[PDB]
UniProtKB/Swiss-Prot annotation, chains A, B:
Protein name as catalogued: Green fluorescent protein
Gene: GFP
Family label: Belongs to the GFP family.
Organism: Aequorea victoria
Task of the protein: Energy-transfer acceptor. Its role is to transduce the blue chemiluminescence of the protein aequorin into green fluorescent light by energy transfer. Fluoresces in vivo upon receiving energy from the Ca(2+)-activated photoprotein aequorin.
One BP annotation, GO: bioluminescence
InterPro entries named among the record's database cross-references: GFP, GFP-related, Green_fluorescent_prot
Phenotype upon changing residue 46 to L: In R10-3; matures to the red-emitting state with excitation and emission maxima at 555 and 585 nm, respectively
Industrial or biotech use: Green fluorescent protein has been engineered to produce a vast number of variously colored mutants, fusion proteins, and biosensors. Further generation of mutants led to more stable proteins (at 37 degrees Celsius for example) with brighter fluorescence and longer fluorescence lifetimes.
Pfam families: GFP
Highest taxon above the source species: Eukaryota
Known outcome of mutating residue 25 to I: In Azurite; shifts the excitation and emission spectra to shorter wavelengths and increases quantum yields compared to BFP
Post-translational modification: Contains a chromophore consisting of modified amino acid residues. Maturation of the chromophore requires nothing other than molecular oxygen.
Outcome following mutation: residue 135 to R: In mut1.28; shifts fluorescence lifetime from 3.03 to 2.76 ns. In mut2.2; shifts fluorescence lifetime from 3.03 to 1.94 ns. In mut3.3; shifts fluorescence lifetime from 3.03 to 1.88 ns
Gene3D superfamilies tied to this protein: Green fluorescent protein
Length: 387, 387
């Protein structure tokens, strides 16, 4: 009864917690300056408990005098994975990010971002007078909203935590879906580029002020940054390195890469999106017959932006009970339903998915799974292979 | 490499599995008969592994000659919880269901369903000549899309599994959101009601054919059903009782009920939906200041139907890392941030949520949590109380 009031009330307070837990980047036009502004919070986990808030204010304005696209209000949704290179002796960060635009219901610069673009990042910083520099290199693939980079502190040890520098260290690699392409300021500014400025307030601590130039130099997208940090506490969360480096129990880069390859089999036109047409094609080639309504409801189920298609980050979320999943997978492979996957059936399944492999490569797949040497893959063999 | 091909391919097949895993009820108009049709599959878990498919074809036509609403294409999404009454010696089923309409983008009979409506269900069946009867009683609350019923076999032992009878045993209790109210055939037919007919094919087994009359008799919504089952196998999944009764590890009815009470504190107008206005009000009363964009993005995050508001089933899904959640909950209660929740602060938090309690009831809440007898609730006390 008292316990029921605590529960009731606690559920409500935890609900506001759960709802506020994953703040997106809120973008708005700035007509006056021919650009945009953005406002958002970042919650950095504190080692051993709690969150350090970082309140971001941002403005971007074009570098050139050309025309740009000035967007309606929308947001960007970001997923970030931080890691370490075990062979790297310098202070560093490996970063993987997926960013997609959303929040509007239902071509200048686009051509620069259709494939993989090399990226260079240079940062010179001063935090409480501690001078430092960072340089990073990698690739962006705006089709998947994907950025992959490795960063090095080129002045020795970073005097602030790596996670605090992530937002500072190329929003032109965000995936805007088709209906929102007219709201992509970032690409419209290219190749001449844009200036990005922010102030970032760390609750109960200091602030960063940054200015950056983001432009192409040849075929490379370059982000060159000046950062000044003031008013930080010597034993606070930033200067004290009390923030958690990476989120626990995320997927491996290698697992993500296998999911991307899997996504490819569906996205036959390579535009970074799975439509009902494409999902249907694959399902039908497998011997299944969804209706249009079933195909649509299937997509809706995982359609976070509500565009009617599955983009890669949405697919990754779904792929990120197990026994029953593996058993149903087995039936799809075992086309005639006799309890054995034959080399022929596997050949056919590969063709059905659009997976081009020689007959010898297929034989090697069976051989890897085929414990009892009958040249076929039974259910128990399939489970060992799948787990 | 062979392993990578298996993984790649397996991920794709499992993805079609995950996507197809929760089929909704697809509804379409039937202009000719002044009614609707529906098509959907039910996957029943087989004890010890696998799924028994049940392919449903449905048609409804009005009982009276009055006008009805003939809908555009849409669907219903259903969550079901089956349980047992430990005191009941008769063969029975306790059923809790939430049903909401979706799949259209962006008043006759409505007035009958604004509060809680008592329900009576009567079924007479013949399966492979085995005669049986079922009678059930409970309540529906269409505001939350909620049905709660208890069913008894009144002829002795049920010759088929309880889960196979769920779809047969009142879609007028579905929650249609505001923008879709003109597509609610089921309520528009009331009080005179409708006839519902289905054929249900159990893959590799027999079929059921049902006919039902659904209407008000006085203030009670009555579902009276005739079921005929033919062609079932004596040792198949149905006549053999080889289907799993209930899904494992669902919430208790008592937990759901505490979540509903929590939902109430937000839904101040009691219409079954939380708007950004209402979420804002509560958050602000707590000392928080979301912007409109933050409030909207918060809702979007859990908005499965894409209507812009949180209905109860959407809230339940969110409420259905823990340490960090409890720590952030503590800070909301501990308004001045001194490490102790005072009786005053708890009083204020109750008022902030719209939770009406006497000062004595609040004192009893502290007393229940207050292990060390200082009249306040510290963090460790709060964790013990919350877990
Ligand atoms: Ca595509
Ligand atoms: Ca989508
Ligand atoms: Ca086979
Ligand atoms: Ca074998
Ligand atoms: Ca409301
Ligand atoms: Ca909603
Ligand atoms: Ca306090
Ligand atoms: Ca105490």
């Amino acid at each position: 009864s008292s316990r029921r009031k605590w529960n009731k009330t606690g559920h409500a307070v935890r609900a506001i917690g759960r709802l506020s837990s994953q703040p997106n980047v809120y973008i708005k036009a700035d007509k006056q300056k021919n650009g945009i502004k953005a406002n958002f919070k970042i919650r950095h986990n504190i080692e051993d408990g709690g969150v350090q808030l970082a309140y971001h204010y941002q403005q971007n304005t074009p570098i050139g005098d050309g025309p740009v696209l000035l967007p309606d209000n929308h947001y960007l949704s970001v997923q970030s994975k931080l890691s370490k290179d075990p062979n790297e002796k310098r202070d560093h960060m490996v970063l993987l990010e997926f960013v997609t635009a959303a929040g509007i219901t239902l071509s200048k610069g686009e051509e620069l971002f259709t494939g993989v673009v090399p990226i260079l990042v240079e940062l010179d910083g001063d935090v409480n007078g501690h001078k430092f520099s960072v340089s990073g290199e990698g690739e962006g693939d705006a089709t998947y909203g994907k950025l992959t980079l490795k960063f090095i502190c080129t002045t020795g040890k970073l005097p602030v935590p790596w996670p605090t520098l992530v937002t500072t260290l190329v929003q032109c690699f965000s995936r805007y879906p088709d209906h929102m392409k007219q709201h992509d300021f970032f690409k419209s500014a290219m190749p001449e580029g844009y200036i990005q400025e922010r102030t970032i307030f760390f609750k109960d601590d200091g602030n960063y002020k940054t200015r950056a130039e983001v432009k192409f130099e040849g075929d490379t997208l370059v982000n060159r940054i000046e950062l000044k940090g003031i008013d930080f506490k010597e034993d606070g969360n930033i200067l004290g390195h009390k923030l958690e480096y990476n989120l626990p129990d995320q997927l491996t880069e290698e697992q993500i890469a296998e999911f991307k390859e899997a996504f490819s089999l569906f996205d036959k036109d390579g535009d970074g999106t799975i439509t009902t047409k494409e999902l249907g094609t694959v399902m039908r080639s497998l011997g299944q017959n969804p209706t249009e309504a079933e195909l649509q409801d299937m997509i809706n189920e995982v359609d976070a932006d509500g565009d009617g298609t599955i983009d890669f980050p949405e697919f990754l979320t779904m792929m990120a009970d197990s026994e029953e999943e593996i058993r149903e997978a087995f039936r799809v492979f075992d086309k005639d339903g006799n309890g054995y996957i034959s080399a022929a059936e596997l050949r056919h399944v590969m063709t059905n998915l659009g997976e081009k492999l020689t007959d010898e490569e297929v034989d090697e797949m069976i051989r890897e799974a085929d414990i009892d040497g009958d040249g076929q893959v039974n259910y128990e063999e399939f489970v060992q292979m799948m787990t």
